[PDB]
Amino acid sequence: MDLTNKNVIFVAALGGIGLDTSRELVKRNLKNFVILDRVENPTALAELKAINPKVNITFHTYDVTVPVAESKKLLKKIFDQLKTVDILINGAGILDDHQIERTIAINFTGLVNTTTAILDFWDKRKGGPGGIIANICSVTGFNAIHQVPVYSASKAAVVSFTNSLAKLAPITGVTAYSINPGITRTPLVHTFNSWLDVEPRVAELLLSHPTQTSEQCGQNFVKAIEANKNGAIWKLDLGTLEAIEWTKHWDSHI
Amino acid sequence: MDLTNKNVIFVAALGGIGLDTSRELVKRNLKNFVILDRVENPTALAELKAINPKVNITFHTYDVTVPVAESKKLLKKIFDQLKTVDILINGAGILDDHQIERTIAINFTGLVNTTTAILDFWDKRKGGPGGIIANICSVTGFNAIHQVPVYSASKAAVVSFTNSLAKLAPITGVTAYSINPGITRTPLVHTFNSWLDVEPRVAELLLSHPTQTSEQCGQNFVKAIEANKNGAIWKLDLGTLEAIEWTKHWDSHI
Ligand SMILES: NC(=O)c1c[n+]([C@@H]2O[C@H](COP(=O)([O-])OP(=O)(O)OC[C@H]3O[C@@H](n4cnc5c(N)ncnc54)[C@H](O)[C@@H]3O)[C@@H](O)[C@H]2O)ccc1[C@@H]1CCCCC1=O
Ligand SMILES: NC(=O)c1c[n+]([C@@H]2O[C@H](COP(=O)([O-])OP(=O)(O)OC[C@H]3O[C@@H](n4cnc5c(N)ncnc54)[C@H](O)[C@@H]3O)[C@@H](O)[C@H]2O)ccc1[C@@H]1CCCCC1=O
Ligand SMILES: [Ca+2]
Ligand SMILES: [Ca+2]
Numbered sequence: 474m475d476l477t478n479k480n481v482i483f484v485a486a487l488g489g490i491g492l493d494t495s496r497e498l499v500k501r502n503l504k505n506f507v508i509l510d511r512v513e514n515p516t517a518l519a520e521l522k523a524i525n526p527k528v529n530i531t532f533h534t535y536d537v538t539v540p541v542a543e544s545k546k547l548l549k550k551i552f553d554q555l556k557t558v559d560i561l562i563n564g565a566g567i568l569d570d571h572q573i574e575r576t577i578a579i580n581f582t583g584l585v586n587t588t589t590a591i592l593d594f595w596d597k598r599k600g601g602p603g604g605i606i607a608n609i610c611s612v613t614g615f616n617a618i619h620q621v622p623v624y625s626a627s628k629a630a631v632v633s634f635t636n637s638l639a640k641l642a643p644i645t646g647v648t649a650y651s652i653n654p655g656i657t658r659t660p661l662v663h664t665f666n667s668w669l670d671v672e673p674r675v676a677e678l679l680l681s682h683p684t685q686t687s688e689q690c691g692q693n694f695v696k697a698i699e700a701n702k703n704g705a706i707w708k709l710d711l712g713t714l715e716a717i718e719w720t721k722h723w724d725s726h727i
Numbered sequence: 728m729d730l731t732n733k734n735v736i737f738v739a740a741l742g743g744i745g746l747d748t749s750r751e752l753v754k755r756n757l758k759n760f761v762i763l764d765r766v767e768n769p770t771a772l773a774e775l776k777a778i779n780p781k782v783n784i785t786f787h788t789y790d791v792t793v794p795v796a797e798s799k800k801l802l803k804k805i806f807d808q809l810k811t812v813d814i815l816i817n818g819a820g821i822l823d824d825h826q827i828e829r830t831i832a833i834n835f836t837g838l839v840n841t842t843t844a845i846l847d848f849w850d851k852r853k854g855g856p857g858g859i860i861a862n863i864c865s866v867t868g869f870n871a872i873h874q875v876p877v878y879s880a881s882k883a884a885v886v887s888f889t890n891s892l893a894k895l896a897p898i899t900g901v902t903a904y905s906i907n908p909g910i911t912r913t914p915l916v917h918t919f920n921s922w923l924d925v926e927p928r929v930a931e932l933l934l935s936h937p938t939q940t941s942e943q944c945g946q947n948f949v950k951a952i953e954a955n956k957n958g959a960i961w962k963l964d965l966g967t968l969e970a971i972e973w974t975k976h977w978d979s980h981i
Contacts, residue, residue, distance in 0.1 A: 541827075573795075573839055581884065582831050585877060589827065592923055614887070615976035622891030623839060626884040630835065633868070633883035637876030644925045655977065669846055671898045675981070682980040710977065720974040722869035723909065723964065726936040727929070 474701035485564035489659025493691030509535035537583025544590035580627035603646025639704035648703035655710030728955035739818035743913025747945030763789035791837025834881035857900025893958035902957035909964030
């Protein structure tokens with residue numbers, strides 16, 4: 474995929490991983506880069522524009538926990554402006570296992586709903602042009618951090634959902650792949666709520682081990698987008714990009 | 728695990744798989760069998776009691792989409808009656824990918840919330856005695872039916888969540904394992920809503936291939952409970968019981 478002159482919507486572009494990905498995206502000379510996020514960040518937007526003034530950068534406030542009809546309304550506004558969208562990147566996430574409902578609503582339901590909404594515009598069965606979805610999941614969707622079991626289970630859900638989208642591309646015209654960071658250091662310093670406080674020190678304990686920077690992650694993220702491989706399960710860990718082979722434990726035969 | 732004289736709570740005991748499991752459970756001569764389900768079924772309750780009159784069978788109306796505080800209140804009522812509970816079986820599920828929010832609420836959030844609520848009574852850190860949780864997930868949590876991607880993703884979530892619970896048993900005193908049916912024929916005749924109607928004939932197409940009966944499933948379900956293996960990922964497919972080895976793609980190192 475050559476990102477030059479493409480139109481990209483990125484939900485949650487302005488977070489720790491998001492902003493370093495966005496810096497690399499705008500270097501790739503997009504036509505339009507449309508950032509949807511829960512809170513404004515006007516300085517980040519200006520930083521991005523300064524990297525490549527040719528890119529048209531727009532922002533819309535967006536909370537992925539709104540109903541699907543509300544997402545459709547916002548997407549309509551964007552499609553009526555841009556006419557075409559080439560790639561949707563769904564990057565929203567929280568980690569807080571004291572917030573069970575909200576974890577699931579943001580990390581899983583909200584990603585499914587944004588996806589369902591954009592299919593109104595893209596599905597080839599309704600006369601749409603098809604499209605490409607990149608979902609930020611997590612290595613915890615392969616193997617949990619069991620001390621944050623709700624977070625990890627929410628990410629297993631979207632790893633699954635993304636695999637399924639990719640298998641539906643012959644029907645819908647929409648391809649998809651997952652982007653699964655390992656532990657990635659950003660400008661922020663975190664502490665996490667574990668489920669029922671089984672482990673108050675998850676952030677500290679993770680950082681005892683080798684990790685990667687958000688710059689490394691962001692570089693490999695854009696490399697994965699450029700590879701444009703339907704059904705890939707990309708691991709972005711320890712500064713490398715690696716496609717994972719999903720184990721076949723069971724087959725529906727359909 | 729010898730189920731004689733044990734106290735078992737079974738959420739969703741009266742469905743297609745549930746009722747055939749329940750028939751085998753009561754043959755195992757439980758002390759108390761407490762059935763929580765969304766709708767009453769007085770004839771089923773009487774059938775069960777007739778299999779083994781020695782078992783004390785009680786019923787409570789329960790919808791897994793209520794808030795965790797409401798689940799705690801009901802569990803308190805049960806613990807104050809029984810004093811001890813040996814095993815919780817979480818079996819609620821729907822399949823309807825036109826109902827995205829409700830699929831996730833029942834299949835994933837609700838199972839997590841019932842689990843979180845019973846940990847108030849069992850967690851060894853609060854002076855509780857520990858316990859055992861059996862979660863009905865699905866083979867689709869290993870490999871999706873991609874035509875029902877929301878259902879399948881909800882089941883990947885609870886396969887993950889259950890693996891994580893099992894790894895927390897040293898902290899909480901609560902062990903856990905997943906029960907993952909393959910395609911299982913019950914007394915009901917179904918048709919399914921696929922996501923965005925990608926495939927209107929999922930039920931018919933599944934049944935083209937080898938399947939198993941709910942009696943076979945129920946027999947292997949009780950066999951898995953009797954094995955009492957923390958962290959097992961049980962596949963109940965084609966009439967057999969098989970533990971699955973989960974692939975290690977990534978390690979947190981914590
Ligand atoms: N930084 C990491 O190491 C990491 C990050 N993730 C995921 O990568 C994505 C970006 O994470 P981050 O940059 O590290 O975090 P950060 O908190 O900096 O960014 C969160 C982004 O999501 C946005 N957001 C949150 N809630 C909403 C909402 N309701 N509506 C719309 N937008 C919302 C928010 O505004 C921001 O753009 C999230 O999905 C993370 O869960 C995946 C893997 C790892 C995680 C790290 C934690 C332990 C386990 C891991 O595997
Ligand atoms: N029968 C199967 O072949 C099968 C069944 N499951 C799961 O096994 C469990 C039992 O399914 P079943 O007996 O086939 O279905 P059935 O519809 O007969 O039973 C559903 C049970 O969940 C209960 N329930 C539903 N909503 C609620 C709620 N809000 N609150 C409390 N209880 C509720 C309901 O009252 C009933 O006891 C569910 O979790 C299923 O998702 C797992 C695997 C397979 C599925 C079959 C469909 C395609 C993909 C497969 O892998
Ligand atoms: Ca270029
Ligand atoms: Ca016995």
